Design a protein around this ligand. Structure first.
Ligand SMILES: Oc1ccc(OCCc2ccccc2)cc1
Length: 162
């Protein structure tokens, strides 16, 4: 188990443009294309991301390459964020995967709201952090995925993905 396998489970794999749980155009392994309601806008973003005229359809290799870029962008975003980096660096490898998973899903807009969760995680107050993480729109809107991520933070094991 690693971050790629974890997010592949949580996001699935689809080779044609689809909509995420919020209704936004997405492709591949959870690659957001646009929040615009315009399918043409999504198709432009796709062609820009892949470097060819895709017509809304990609190959598995292309989906996996976008996925690698997206995971790396999440990691680098954590490392560049003065609030997230100290917490990330305090975690073991399995819990770091849970952190990347959340940033992959929510980006930087969730940083402020998760201030108290981040403190509890840095303090290694795992049960309290798990309770706090569930008091969120994130948990209420995607509860099964959030429960898996939270269990990973609570236990430091892959039990929720096995
Ligand atoms: O959009 C978000 C949502 C939640 C966040 O924090 C919780 C997960 C985490 C833990 C350690 C290091 C980085 C991230 C950060 C951004």
């Amino acid at each position: 188990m690693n971050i790629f396998e974890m997010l592949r489970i949580d996001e699935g794999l689809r080779l044609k443009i689809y909509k995420d749980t919020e209704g936004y155009y997405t492709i591949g392994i959870g690659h957001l294309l646009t929040k615009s309601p315009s399918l043409n806008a999504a198709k432009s973003e796709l062609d820009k991301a892949i470097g060819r005229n895709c017509n809304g359809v990609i190959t598995k290799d292309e989906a996996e390459k976008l996925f690698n870029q997206d995971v790396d962008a999440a990691v680098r975003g954590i490392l560049r964020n003065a609030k997230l980096k100290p917490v990330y660096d305090s975690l073991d490898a399995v819990r770091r995967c849970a952190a990347i998973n959340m940033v992959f899903q929510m980006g930087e807009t969730g940083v402020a709201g998760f201030t108290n969760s981040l403190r509890m995680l840095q303090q290694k107050r795992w049960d309290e952090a798990a309770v706090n993480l569930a008091k969120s729109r994130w948990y209420n809107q995607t509860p099964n995925r959030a429960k898996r991520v939270i269990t990973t933070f609570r236990t430091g094991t892959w039990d929720a993905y096995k």
